[PDB]
């Protein structure tokens, strides 16, 4: 599995590690300058990041009551953001994914689809991911085994014009979801964004408002240097929400506060575990709840 117990396998490392440590020292406590002091320490270990650290810190300062029980209110606000997708009146429903590679994206395409093809609606999968002949294949093997087309070209594809093909076959066909699979290498900055730009662009074509999600994936795992990257794709293209991957896999699930407060984008999903049914739709209240309880 139910909603808490993916969020406790998710949280498992980062309470064990840090916020196991954080509920202990403000339960039942008044924040004081040795609480603060050790709080401030205990954030930043934790992926919290300077600034978000610093906004719990001030915010904290505003109450006399049980800080732990303020903490609580405070993060539920810093994740108090809309996690529904922006499906549009009239299919297909055209999503891009975004992030650098190794971070989940391909396993996330992966899972959304079988997520839609089990609320009942017709998937189409596009290869853009275009260099990657393994990328490539990992998508055909996840579009056969949850039940969805997949449009692919053979490796060296323009991946505008596989994401422009995969929209015009949705299109044609009335089919209700397009998930785009996009290229991640890193070691070329101008490059990749002209890149994205191209797919972002080449969907108007088709479909004037597609895409109407634009989900960046980011991996826990990375911690800060995720968070760094992430900026990045927020300049290339206009990032709708986030797909915050492998969070049992770290204790840095922190960085999920990091990443709300400091980027302003909703977070969507989180993925925990290799399952298909580890991707699941972001919950911020439960999410508080385990990650602060006793
Ligand atoms: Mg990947």
Not at 137 to 147: A, F, T
Not at 226 to 250: P, S
Request: proline share 3%; charged share 30%; with cysteine.
């Amino acid at each position: 599995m139910g909603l808490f117990d993916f969020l406790k396998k998710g949280l498992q490392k980062t309470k064990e590690t840090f916020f196991g440590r954080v509920v202990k020292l403000l339960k039942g406590k008044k924040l004081d300058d040795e609480t603060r002091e050790e709080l401030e320490e205990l954030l930043i270990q934790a992926d919290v990041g300077v600034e978000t650290t610093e906004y719990i810190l001030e915010r904290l300062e505003e109450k006399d009551g049980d800080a732990l029980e303020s903490l609580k209110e405070i993060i539920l606000e810093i994740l108090n953001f809309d996690t529904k997708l922006n499906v549009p009146p009239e299919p297909p429903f055209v999503i891009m994914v975004v992030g650098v590679n190794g971070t989940g994206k391909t396993t996330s395409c992966g899972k959304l689809a079988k997520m839609f093809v089990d609320e009942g609606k017709s998937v189409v999968l596009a290869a853009a991911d275009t260099f990657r002949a393994a990328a490539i294949e990992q998508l055909k093997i996840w579009g056969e085994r949850v039940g969805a087309t997949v449009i692919s070209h053979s490796e060296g594809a323009d991946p505008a014009a596989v994401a422009f093909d995969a929209v015009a076959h949705a299109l044609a066909r009335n089919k209700d979801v397009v998930i785009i699979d996009t290229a991640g290498r890193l070691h070329t900055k101008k490059n990749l964004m002209e890149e994205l730009r191209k797919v972002h662009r080449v969907v108007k074509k088709k479909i004037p408002d597609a895409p109407h999600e634009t989900l960046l994936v980011i991996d826990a795992t990375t911690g800060q240097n995720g968070l760094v990257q992430a900026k990045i794709f927020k300049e290339a293209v206009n990032v709708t929400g986030i797909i915050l991957t492998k969070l049992d896999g770290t204790a840095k699930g922190g960085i999920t506060l990091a990443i709300a407060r400091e980027l302003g984008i909703p977070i969507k999903f989180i993925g925990v575990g290799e399952k298909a049914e580890d991707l699941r739709p972001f919950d911020p209240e439960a999410f508080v709840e385990v990650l602060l309880s006793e």
